[PDB]
Amino acid sequence: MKVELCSFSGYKIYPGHGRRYARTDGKVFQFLNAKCESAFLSKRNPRQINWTVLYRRKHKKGQ
């Protein structure tokens, strides 16, 4: 079974969990929960939010 990846956070979405948003111009996004989905719909930037994956990647944290 294909495991998707949250379009906002970057975590792994398992078969049962999350949702999908289909915008009027294609561009389907997968979401892990209504925290990601709401930070997306609010038009937040995943790179300025400490817990996302694009943040840890930008600031090179971890390793």
Binding site: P15, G16, G18, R19, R20, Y21, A22, R23, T24, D25, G26, V28
Partner: protein, 131 residues
Amino acid sequence: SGAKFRISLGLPVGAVINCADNTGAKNLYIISVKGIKGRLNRLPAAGVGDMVMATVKKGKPELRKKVHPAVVIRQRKSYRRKDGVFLYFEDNAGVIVNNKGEMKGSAITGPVAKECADLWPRIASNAGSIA
């Protein structure tokens, strides 16, 4: 062969969905759903893939003030799929149709849910995307 599964219908009778094809119609006032028996004090309710009777409220005047068939191609309410997904679109939209299924228009602006493509071939042909 394959039969339409049930989805979380979310378009009561009175919904004004936008008209996602190039027939010059801008709206679709849903006036009743096809295939609904009913119940005391229970509005009919259409979902993705359900044929309905609608009415163009704004658009070309040769389409207004009359009843039309239509098919809901995108609903905003989150419906579940048997494969364990919950999908929903950015807007409600449907296309106009004749009683045998052929689209009155030519193109479809935007996606078309696979619950509507598996079911209406002449809408999947004029489709732009799927799901």
